[PDB]
Amino acid sequence: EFNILLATDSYKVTHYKQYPPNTSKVYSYFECREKKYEETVFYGLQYILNKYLKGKVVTKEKIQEAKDVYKEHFQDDVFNEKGWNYILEKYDGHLPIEIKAVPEGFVIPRGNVLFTVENTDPECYWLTNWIETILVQSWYPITVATNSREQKKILAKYLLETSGNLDGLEYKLHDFGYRGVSSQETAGIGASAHLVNFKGTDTVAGLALIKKYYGTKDPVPGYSVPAAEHSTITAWGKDHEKDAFEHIVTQFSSVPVSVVSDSYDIYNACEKIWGEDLRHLIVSRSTQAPLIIRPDSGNPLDTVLKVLEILGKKFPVTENSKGYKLLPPYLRVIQGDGVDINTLQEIVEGMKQKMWSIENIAFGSGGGLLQKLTRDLLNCSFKCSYVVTNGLGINVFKDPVADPNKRSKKGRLSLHRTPAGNFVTLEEGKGDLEEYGQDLLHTVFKNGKVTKSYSFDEIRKNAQLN
Amino acid sequence: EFNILLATDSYKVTHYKQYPPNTSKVYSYFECREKKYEETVFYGLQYILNKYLKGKVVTKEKIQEAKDVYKEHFQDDVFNEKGWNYILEKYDGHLPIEIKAVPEGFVIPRGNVLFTVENTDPECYWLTNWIETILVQSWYPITVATNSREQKKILAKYLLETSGNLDGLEYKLHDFGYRGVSSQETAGIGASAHLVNFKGTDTVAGLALIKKYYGTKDPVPGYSVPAAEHSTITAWGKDHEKDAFEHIVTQFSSVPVSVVSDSYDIYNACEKIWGEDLRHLIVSRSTQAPLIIRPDSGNPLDTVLKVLEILGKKFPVTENSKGYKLLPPYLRVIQGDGVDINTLQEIVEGMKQKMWSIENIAFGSGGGLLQKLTRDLLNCSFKCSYVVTNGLGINVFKDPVADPNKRSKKGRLSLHRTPAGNFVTLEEGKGDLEEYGQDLLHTVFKNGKVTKSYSFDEIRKNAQLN
Predict the structure, then answer these.
(1) Cα separation of B85 and B8, whole Å?
(2) Radius of gyration of chain A (CA)
(3) Which of A122, B126, B225, B322 has the maximum number of C-beta atoms within 10 A of its C-beta?
(4) Contact criterion met (CB below 8 Å) for A304 and A361
(5) Are strands A173-175 and A392-395 parallel, antiparallel or unpaired?
(6) What is the C-alpha to C-alpha distance for residues A459 and A210, in angstroms, rounded to an integer?
(7) Residue B107: in which H helix or E strand, if any?
(8) Shortest Cα–Cα distance, A63 to chain B (Å)
(9) Which residues of chain B are in CATH 3.20.20.70 domains?
């Protein structure tokens, strides 16, 4: 079972001995520091609050377990047993902490307060930053949601330009990340963050998280279609790729079916197998049940373009009202190898140059979507901005000489709408002056209780494109 | 409660309808495909086998849960209820699977079989690749352990050259990755993989994982020391950095203490505060309790060299037997910002050129250690190599035209020792001929039971440097 006393950076166990004596308040905040990613989707905190922070998180046994672990870990009894015992006896193991946050789904420019953390009991000054490690991991759902939305922006731009509308945009980027992530828990968090912007996913773990922690009006937030992998093609034998293809499209004749086509020769498969041998089983398919050809190797741009040129000469191509080439509705392509934000841009631009509509293409992303992202990409940072020592409020900050970018905000913080309708973070408690409107940060956690929740439906609405 | 029926790529739910009719066996394997990183540390499978795969993993309730989820996810009743009911009834929910693996900790050259997976019941031919997604996530602990060991090689080379020995090598790279990873589960897995090579960690989650799934003779596999963060320094106010420093070193006067010194001006802190104002409190410390100065910003190489230059002029530097400069034993430096394998190399080489011993420095790594790694760094892949259809064994493989690197191995596989003492993977069942020794793979899992296990002590011994 999860023990919050063992869920921090080791050195934070020693910090209660490090703050100035007579400190009654520690107030800290999270931001995506300003320096490609001008605005961030705030998502994921509610998961953390519910799974890890709420309710009775301290027990006698948990305190003893932590005491025993840290004694060996440090070779010293530096663990604050008295401090944790106080929480257990006074608050029945509920954390005397207040967390205020921007509503989830909100799209906020870089360099703005996203959430704040503070202790509600002066004895628990040390607790604000104890829980930094747990809270800071919100960097991941934020970064996945943000990167996913930036890819949606690119797709929207090119789909609109080449077709004149955004029909099916929310299905243009499929989540293939399940195997390429670091853990089962990461799979769920990452997949749920992608589902803020899109509806197609192969990472089932995402659906259960959303149901448990957020909720949606629909039975499920995400969807998928039957698809072949290399094992289900290659198991038929080298000389029987055609038989594999035929069997699979016939098994799934009434639904969309994605068939990996690069097992031996992607170009042969498109021209000879799909384009000649099995053409009769493709042209008969419904518009609601297309064959989706999936290349999975080679240069992503070159392969997509060559596949489209092959299919264009084997199947009846039309020209839409924008002047771009369009494959028949029963035939589509998905590129799900080596796709990240950079290559996505490269492929759609290359397609546009070759006069191919983005209607023809869907993308799938694995490691690029859920794994190859770091805390430093959006400069996600958790820093103390305010303390009360000897009854006096002190505005605190770091400002490293060699990196002005690492300078942090001062004092009590609040987020506000500007007169032009943008966002501003007010520092040094200046939010109290009421010169701007209402603070956009709402209390979401107080004294062991989740005080404000958002459904996944609201989050999706908040995170919409303009 | 984890549900294995919902712990797979969505499309794998549809694969039982895709294999050739009358397929009784599907046999698959994991490798780190060939063409730095010439050899990989196999670590992490045991965690997965125990946490997710062993015992009764199928129940009536779990089948019903999966059925209802996939019905909505696919908008169709494609879920193999009949297949999973068979496993529940015939085997009491135990997976009819055999997994054979190389011993954990083993250092194996790229392009060799690391584990194999096969069904033990003809009815469950589809199960082999159902569990691909779960097993493939072993890429992560493999890659962390491998990258960690590669960094250890660099440290060993430069420590030996500048000092003449490897004393304290196992503490030269500290895990700071807890907040920089994507989840709590990832933190545990990654930290445990780092601990294969080193003993210093701030990711407490790693300790419990090792304790539960591997075991060690010591009460604890990893250790840490008291350390300051920016909040515990900046909380004192900008004009009181010296007071913060003095308080912290006096609180931890008999143990090692790391103090982040870059809050405002790293060079001022080193020269004026540590080097003058509080010098009397540093020179009095024991060899067992050094002050460890932590820069945390700027160019990692330039900052380390300047800090050492500063300290060298304020403190009594000696010259070791190899001719390299050595700070007094009560004074050390840790660089834990911007450290990955590339920058680690750059720093130690730069120190060597300026005649500073590696004894002086330790490193910490966060995102670069546990987060910024992908499945395709070591070309980790899970592929079917052998099937039995109509009672006939068939050698199976993919061989994409535009990427011969993605070519997979053929038939039943085995790992052998060559006459020169190296590793070789035999294909197409040729290991049966016994022209080499016995198969080096061990059955680690069979029919719901873990059949072979390794302690964390064994793993560390297996993964040691040459």
Answers:
(1) 18
(2) 26
(3) B225
(4) yes
(5) unpaired
(6) 11
(7) strand B107-109
(8) 15
(9) 137-374+454-466
> Can you give the resolution of this entry in Å?
2.0
Contact A207 B69 (CB under 8 A): yes
Phi, psi (degrees; rounded to nearest 5) at B307? -60, -45
Give whole-number Cα distances, B326 to B161, B267, B268, B305, B354, in Å. 14, 19, 21, 13, 12
CA A9 – CA A13 distance, rounded (Å): 8
Closest CA to B25 of B122, B90, B95: B122
Q: Which residue has the tokens 């834990």?
A: B336
Q: Which residues of A404-416 are buried (b: 16+ CB within 10 A; e: fewer)?
A: eebebbbbbbbbb
End-to-end C-alpha distance for chain A, whole angstroms: 43
Q: Count chain A–chain B contacts defined by CB atoms under 8 A.
A: 338
Superfamily of domain A137-374+454-466: Aldolase class I (3.20.20.70)
Q: What angle do CA B367, B369, B370 make, to 5 degrees?
A: 70
How many angstroms separate the Cα of A109 from the Cα of each of A33, A99, A150, A410?
10, 21, 13, 19
Instruction: Please answer whether residues B227 and B259 qualify as being in contact, where contact means their C-beta atoms are separated by less than 8 angstroms.
Output: yes
Cα–Cα distance, A31 to A8 (Å, whole number): 20
Give contacts of B204 with chain A, Cβ < 8 Å.
6-10, 69, 73
Helix (H, G, I), strand (E, B) or coil at B230: helix
Question: Which residues 212-271 of A have a C-beta within 8 angstroms of B?
Answer: 219-220, 222-232, 234-238, 240, 243-244, 247-248, 251-252, 255, 258, 262-268
User: H/E element holding B450?
Assistant: strand B449-450
DSSP B338: S
Query: What phi and psi, each to the nearest 5 degrees, are found at residue B168?
Result: 70, 15
CA A38 to chain centre: 16
Residue B165: other Cβ atoms inside 10 A: 11
Place of tokens 């060993």: B156
Give the torsion sign (CA, B342, B347, B353, B357): negative
Asked if B137 is an interface residue toward chain A (Cβ–Cβ < 8 A), one would say yes
C-alpha to C-alpha distance for A164 and B111, rounded to whole angstroms? 48
Binding residues of B for diphosphate: 179, 230, 294
Q: Which helix (H) or strand (E) holds B162?
A: helix B139-163
Provide the angle, in degrees to the nearest 10, between the axes of the packed helices A341-353 and A139-163: 0
All residues at 6 or more sequence positions from B204 whose CB lies less than 8 Å from its CB, including other chains:
A6, A7, A8, A9, A10, A69, A73, B178
In angstroms, the CA A359 to CA B332 distance is 60
